[PDB]
Design a protein around this ligand. Structure first.
Ligand code: PX4
Ligand code: PX4
Ligand code: PX4
Ligand code: PX4
Ligand code: PX4
Ligand code: PX4
Ligand code: PX4
Ligand code: PX4
Ligand code: PX4
Ligand code: PX4
Ligand code: CPS
Ligand code: CPS
Ligand code: CPS
Ligand code: CPS
Lengths: 236, 236, 236, 236
């Protein structure tokens, strides 16, 4: 258990984390530069090796962090991320070559301020799941109806449940929903608007109400906590 | 009144509701699958019967639920929905064939968490009705003016009160409002912008103010309830 | 002063207001119907007279309301509106023929619930004026720069301060800002994005902050009022 | 130190500030007018001199304000702005000719109400910096992936990290994201949607959560301050 503390003091040291971050930033610049064909024609060889080096150092770092953290490591979402993303970069040189750039998100996992933002942002999601489920069901149903109503005459937009899903998502963002989709549809189906206006109403109303209910239920909790605090003093 | 309790204990049983939901989910998968011509060519016959079965079971379920709930059933919005949607699926094999997929919304009526979301979301609507009335009047008036101003030269977009309504709704979502509608209009009516900018201002200002007044009047009520609670202790 | 009370009791009577509203709604239907060339070919003559009648009754009503309310009438925004809108409908049979439909907004002036909505919605505006002034200055400045930078090569979108104003408003609503304006601009002015991205950032940031500051300064006032209430009891 | 107070009483006088503002507004009108080729053909000479005069007066004003405020001047963001913007207008008659119009923002620096708005609006930014950093990293990463995935076949939209950045910004504003970018992409890359839908989800979710967290953390502070106030009285 000597070498253990020895490594642990490295793995936990301020310097170690700083080094890794330094590499993250270095490699991030490198991956931008590798985007230029010009740059690659001249320095591609060097950069490719720098990637291999960084990826080796990260593998080593993951290995050390597992030895130090043991099981706790795989119960830690940030370390899992670091793990999965380094592992991707390990598969021998398709889509995976491009997914190697995901290692730059380690800058989030390695910077405490970033973690906190991401954690804060993510933390709202658990309470949204049933509204998401509801909307997903809503899309599913509409997608099925839209495939049946319009897929024969408008196969690109609705020929298939998946295409209908896609188009409905496009309608929800309001992108070209009328000039691009519903007006062409109405040239064959004069009542297409009876399908898409209500669809647009639900989806936009649900989105707004989701934002409203977050703010207001938040403040209600702030109000409750305050109330208890005030009540205690009055009680006391 | 024996058979009544007998049925009631079925209709109210955990298992019964679970079965029905199980069917809802089963049939939901089925209706997705029926979307593939491939899938239908092979298994269409089986699926069509599964639909008939599910629809029979649901009819039976509605009948039992009415016998058990009696009048209370038709005073219950969820049961009415379940009723209307199963009934649609009953009309003999137009639009109605597609509206059969609406039976998948029974997953909302049958899942308590879904009910609560939908109830919460719906509950804001009663207080919005006069703002909706106001906006509807606003559209109506603008639609009439737009038909008169532009319908002769731009019949597709404004030739008819209903087309003007449609286009105005499109303008409100901001979809291609300028490149698609107002710039072409301005090639004949240089002052078309004097009609649509203000229109855009009202409608977007009303939408935002509607969201603002929901949040803030909500918190004011939270503030009032808190105040009373605090005051009582101070009074006591 | 007898006939005065006599008229006043009419003008103030529940029935009188109800009659006028009844006409507003009647005439509103009529103006929709007059939108159909079919309908006009058959009943245009009758409708035209019904408009004249309604407009006469409204003139009479305004006259009575002035005699009853005297000066107070012209200090009342709703009555001024009713006045200006009936007056428009008086100018002998251009744009004015279409502005006659504005008389249907009297349904707002005559329905107390509508007044309250409109008053509530309008009431936020006084505090927005300096932000509006700021943004207007912002547009003005950008419009001038955009005219100078792009008006020679892109006259339709920027050839004139007014066209630049229009296009900038379009950019603010995000309507086709890239595919329709900035990408074409960038084919001649590769750095057009340095002008429009920041412009888009300011305008969207100002809009959001305007909404945020309304909600939060509202709640701060709600908080202050509550505080005082609670403090008094504690003081007492 | 006599002439110092002499000047200081000028530079600080109500009249001086009023004069400068008067010029700002005058020159603002002038710069609008200079936008018309017609207007310039007739009065361009006069206007050009009026610009030179105003710019001289402003230079003089800056010089006096520095003599009066000394070092404090260059520690003052508003004066720095006034400085930088007048200085631009000094470079001898490219882009700089157009940037001279930026001097009209001195109306903001010189009007206390405007300052306060701008200060209020700006004040939220310090707390947003890490979320901005996060998003910027997010764009950077996506931009790199999009360049690699799509730049060869779609060079205008993704051929270069900078073009990908631009397109991704366009996608974030939702402008033609589907009809204009992703549907064309999907004709070659059927799974392009797996890249852009999630991208759209993150960016819109982060934007909304940023607004939500501003409102709610604001109210939490309002709640805390109120609590302390109430607690003191109870304590007292
Ligand atoms: C509440 C959560 C709802 C979640 C719904 C998510 C479903 C997403 C399915 C997307 C399908 C994408 C594939 C596609 O579009 O084309 C494949 C075939 C038609 O093509 P093809 O077979 O070539 O003719 O089309 C099909 O493959 C039909 C796919 C049917 C699968 C349905 C499974 C969803 C279960 C949801 C059940 C809940 C209902 C109460
Ligand atoms: C607050 C409310 C937010 C909204 C909640 C969710 C709303 C629905 C989102 C739908 C997303 C759009 C899905 C989509 O684009 O289609 C994906 C596939 C279609 O696959 P495909 O057949 O390949 O067609 C793609 C187009 N094509 C033919 C030209 C290649 O079809 C599918 O299989 C996708 C089925 C839906 C899966 C995604 C829905 C659940 C994920 C929810 C995300 C929230 C997590 C934070
Ligand atoms: C809440 C959910 C609302 C869902 C209901 C949406 C109904 C409107 C959708 C729609 O327009 O579908 C059109 C169908 C199809 O028949 P239809 O529009 O009457 O014309 C078919 C023309 N032809 C011969 C070229 C095929 O028929 C109709 O829509 C007629 C109504
Ligand atoms: C405050 C709530 C306002 C609610 C307004 C909702 C009105 C929606 C009507 C939509 C009309 C759709 C039919 C359409 O556009 O074309 C039919 C004809 C013209 O076609 P055509 O006859 O073939 O020549 O055009 C017409 O049919 C003329 C339709 C006139 C009906 C007007 C009834 C609305 C009553 C609102 C009165 C309140 C005003 C104070
Ligand atoms: C918070 C504010 C939200 C906004 C409140 C409402 C704003 C106004 C919504 C207007 C909805 C758009 C209506 C529309 O698209 O036109 C429907 C018909 C026109 O029928 P049509 O003559 O068939 O023309 C359709 C286009 N065409 C010719 C190519 C087939 O013309 C009509 O007859 C429709 C008349 C209006 C009916 C809908 C307005 C009342 C429902 C409000 C929904 C709120 C409930 C939650
Ligand atoms: C802070 C509030 C700012 C409010 C700004 C509102 C100004 C709106 C002016 C819109 C001009 C529309 C007419 C137009 O675009 O074309 C007319 C000529 C060029 O055409 P042309 O003469 O035919 O060559 O172009 C012109 O007529 C030039 C117009 C110059 C008038 C400038 C008056 C605005 C005073 C704002 C001064 C505050 C600056 C500190
Ligand atoms: C919360 C922030 C909200 C934003 C605050 C205001 C932002 C700026 C709004 C600008 C509105 C757009 C103005 C516009 O479209 O151009 C109007 C004229 C141009 O006249 P024109 O030369 O006829 O060109 C029109 C296009 N054309 C050549 C094809 C016919 O050019 C002008 O003369 C208009 C000059 C601006 C006047 C409107 C700005 C002050 C009104 C603010 C409204 C708020 C009141 C609630
Ligand atoms: C905060 C406000 C920011 C305002 C600054 C915006 C600057 C970018 C706007 C822009 O792209 O204007 C382009 C100007 C014009 O010269 P330039 O873009 O260099 O090319 C002119 C090409 N030619 C020969 C066909 C005329 O020149 C340049 O922009 C070059 C930089
Ligand atoms: C967290 C903050 C992230 C901030 C990222 C901001 C980066 C913005 C760079 C925009 C590049 C614009 C120039 C461009 O697109 O084309 C130039 C070349 C390709 O053209 P070419 O060389 O002609 O082939 O393409 C290039 O020049 C490649 C540019 C690579 C520079 C990368 C520097 C960003 C450092 C961020 C490192 C953090 C990662 C953890
Ligand atoms: C609340 C979340 C808000 C979002 C936070 C930031 C999100 C990312 C914003 C990205 C802005 C878009 C940048 C952009 O359009 O590209 C600029 C250059 C590309 O240069 P370039 O190679 O010239 O290509 C331009 C297009 N072209 C080829 C046809 C001329 O590529 C670059 O070099 C730009 C690299 C990014 C710089 C801007 C990001 C940091 C500034 C954040 C602003 C917030 C301050 C309040
Ligand atoms: C309104 C719906 C549920 C509708 C049904 O019910 C959803 C929207 C997202 C959820 C909020 C977030 O999760 C953040 C936070 C979690 C706390 O734990 C409770 C407070 C708060 C604000 C949640 C309450 C909100 O209401 C939830 C239940
Ligand atoms: C501002 C306007 C009315 C304008 C006029 O007045 C509308 C917008 C929607 C309505 C709100 C929702 O109904 C939810 C909830 C119902 C409670 O009962 C009272 C509180 C709250 C937040 C309502 C107050 C809000 O103000 C209403 C009256
Ligand atoms: C933030 C800016 C001013 C920025 C500078 O300062 C603007 C935005 C619109 C204004 C609000 C509305 O007027 C409604 C209401 C009026 C009350 O009287 C005070 C409270 C409240 C919420 C106002 C405070 C808000 O802050 C104002 C001053
Ligand atoms: C949620 C994130 C941080 C996420 C991580 O953490 C960002 C969003 C913008 C920031 C707000 C603004 O700066 C205005 C104001 C400054 C005060 O000083 C504290 C309160 C308030 C409302 C800030 C708290 C908010 O939470 C910050 C930290």
């Amino acid at each position: 258990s000597h070498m253990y503390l020895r490594i642990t003091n490295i793995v936990e040291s301020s310097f170690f984390t700083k080094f890794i971050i330094y590499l993250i930033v270095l490699n991030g610049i490198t991956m931008g530069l590798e985007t230029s064909k010009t740059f690659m024609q001249s320095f591609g060889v060097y950069t490719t090796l720098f990637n291999q080096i960084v990826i080796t150092i990260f593998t080593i770092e993951i290995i050390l962090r597992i030895y130090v953290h043991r099981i706790s490591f795989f119960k830690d979402p940030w370390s899992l991320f670091d793990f999965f993303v380094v592992a991707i970069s390990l598969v021998p040189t398709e889509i995976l070559r491009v997914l190697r750039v995901l290692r730059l998100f380690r800058l989030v996992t390695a910077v405490p301020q970033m973690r906190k933002i991401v954690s804060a942002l993510i933390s709202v999601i658990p309470g949204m799941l049933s509204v998401i489920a509801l909307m997903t069901l809503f899309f599913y149903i509409f997608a099925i109806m839209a495939t049946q109503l319009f897929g024969e005459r408008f196969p690109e937009w609705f020929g298939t449940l998946g295409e209908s899903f896609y188009t409905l998502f496009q309608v929800m963002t309001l992108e070209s929903w009328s000039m691009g989709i519903v007006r062409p549809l109405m040239e064959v189906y004069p009542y297409a608007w009876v399908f898409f206006i209500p669809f647009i109403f639900v989806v936009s109303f649900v989105m707004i109400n989701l934002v409203v209910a977050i703010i207001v239920d938040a403040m209600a909790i702030l109000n409750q906590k305050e109330e208890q605090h005030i009540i205690d003093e009055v009680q006391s």
